[PDB]
């Protein structure tokens, strides 16, 4: 129960490896949905739940529109999942073996202390205010409404200009 975040980070690494290995975009969206859920779990484990749930919802909508588009235009008669080429599977397991090799090397080389096998799960949350109200994530995202109105207005203008941009691109 100490290495839970490390297991999640390894799963995120595997999902990003599959996305890099580039299946058919159906399975690419699947891998990105899995990676988004895993990253949500990592953020929730590290702290406030609002950021993880936000990135989960956002990537759910994004990969849904992506699924629609890869059905519409980015498709082929035989969409390769991962086993159309044995090189893709061999490279996936090669990357997994390289990941295990590098983390074993960095555990053996414990001078810097980036990854430690004995010290894993000991330095996840550093210092927390034990007694205290209104210290969770989402209060800062609310402070975007009052303390970073410049961040709020550049995000809003980005979305507004983006509406105009996409209409003019797909005007045809």
């Amino acid at each position: 129960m100490n290495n839970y975040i490390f297991v999640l980070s390894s799963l995120f690494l595997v999902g990003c490896l599959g996305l890099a290995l580039k299946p058919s975009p159906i399975y690419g969206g699947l891998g990105l949905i899995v990676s988004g859920f895993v990253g949500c779990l990592m953020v929730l484990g590290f702290g406030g739940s609002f950021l993880g749930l936000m990135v989960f919802l956002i990537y759910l909508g994004g990969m849904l529109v992506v699924f629609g588009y890869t059905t519409a235009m980015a498709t082929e008669e035989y969409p390769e999942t991962w086993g159309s080429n044995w090189l893709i599977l061999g490279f996936l397991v090669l990357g997994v073996i390289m990941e295990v090799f590098l983390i074993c090397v960095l555990n053996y080389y414990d001078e810097v202390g980036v990854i430690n096998l004995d010290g894993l799960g000991d330095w996840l949350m550093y210092e927390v205010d034990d007694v205290g109200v209104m210290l969770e994530g989402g209060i800062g995202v609310a402070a975007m409404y009052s303390c970073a109105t410049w961040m709020m207005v550049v995000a809003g203008w980005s979305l507004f200009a983006g509406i105009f941009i996409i209409i003019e691109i797909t005007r045809d």
Partner: protein, 96 residues
């Protein structure tokens, strides 16, 4: 009705937070004393029994500032049990 009831709930929240404020110094004193007790027992257990390596200082800090640096969760529960460390890391988060 929502205006009146939300104002009443604001008054109730102020009452609860004032009860918390009145209980704050006792919790602060007990928390500081417990933290110092854990640090002292860690320092003694590192001091007498743990370290006989010739090049080692027992109570050596890692800062030159010579003032109080509050301890980390992994610093104060590092010598404790793994279940206690996991409770200190993921107690509030997993309690749902």
């Amino acid at each position: 009705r929502m205006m009146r009831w939300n104002q009443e709930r604001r008054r109730l929240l102020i009452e609860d937070l004032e009860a918390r404020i009145a209980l704050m110094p006792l919790f602060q004193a007990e928390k500081d004393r417990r933290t110092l007790q854990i640090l002292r027992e860690n320092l003694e257990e590192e001091a007498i029994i743990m370290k006989d390596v010739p090049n080692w200082k027992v109570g050596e800090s890692v800062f030159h500032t010579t003032r109080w640096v509050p301890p980390l969760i992994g610093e104060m529960y590092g010598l404790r049990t793994k279940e206690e460390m996991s409770n200190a890391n993921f107690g509030f988060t997993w309690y749902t």
